[PDB]
């Protein structure tokens, strides 16, 4: 039950409770039924300090959910630009692919998260890593009528 409380604290951003649980011996790399560890949920909810602290505590950066999503995938899809910045600062793979083949850039482009697209492209995100369906970030941005994202994607090249 302690692990569940730690995961809930990570979700809610209660950094003090999470730190107390970790000090009590709660595993850092615990995860819920969906495979979302504390870093995954912290990235989801945009709790930057939680991300920094979890990274300090030797949490695996490139651990994936059952969908195959890393913390960076989750941050990009959620549109948490600051969290994406911190994750990349700590060495997040910006070109990791999920089981379906989605990259973080694809998720940012599909969700019209322009700043995340900006940062990922500026950090070497390859906009040609297609999905199993054969779609590129430019393709999905065109499909959804995300016009600023499409313009930036073609401009960067």
């Amino acid at each position: 039950d302690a692990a569940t409380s730690f995961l809930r604290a990570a979700r809610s951003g209660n950094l003090d409770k999470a730190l107390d649980h970790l000090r009590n011996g709660v595993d850092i790399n615990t995860c819920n039924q969906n495979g979302l560890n504390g870093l995954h949920l912290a990235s989801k909810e945009g709790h930057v300090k939680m991300v920094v602290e979890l990274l300090h505590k030797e949490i695996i950066l490139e651990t994936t959910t059952k969908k195959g999503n890393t913390a960076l995938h989750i941050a990009a899809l959620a549109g948490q630009d600051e969290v994406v910045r911190e994750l990349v600062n700590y060495g997040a793979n910006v070109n990791a692919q999920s089981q379906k083949g989605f990259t973080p850039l694809y998720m940012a482009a599909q969700e019209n998260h322009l700043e995340v697209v900006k940062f990922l492209l500026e950090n070497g995100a390859n906009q040609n890593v297609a999905t199993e369906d054969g779609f590129t970030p430019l393709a999905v941005a065109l499909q959804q009528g995300h016009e600023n994202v499409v313009a930036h994607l073609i401009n960067y090249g």
Binding site: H40, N69, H73, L77, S98, Y106, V140, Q144
Partner: peptide
């Protein structure tokens, strides 16, 4: 919509 990442 098709060809979207869904969920987390």
């Amino acid at each position: 919509f098709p060809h979207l990442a869904v969920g987390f």
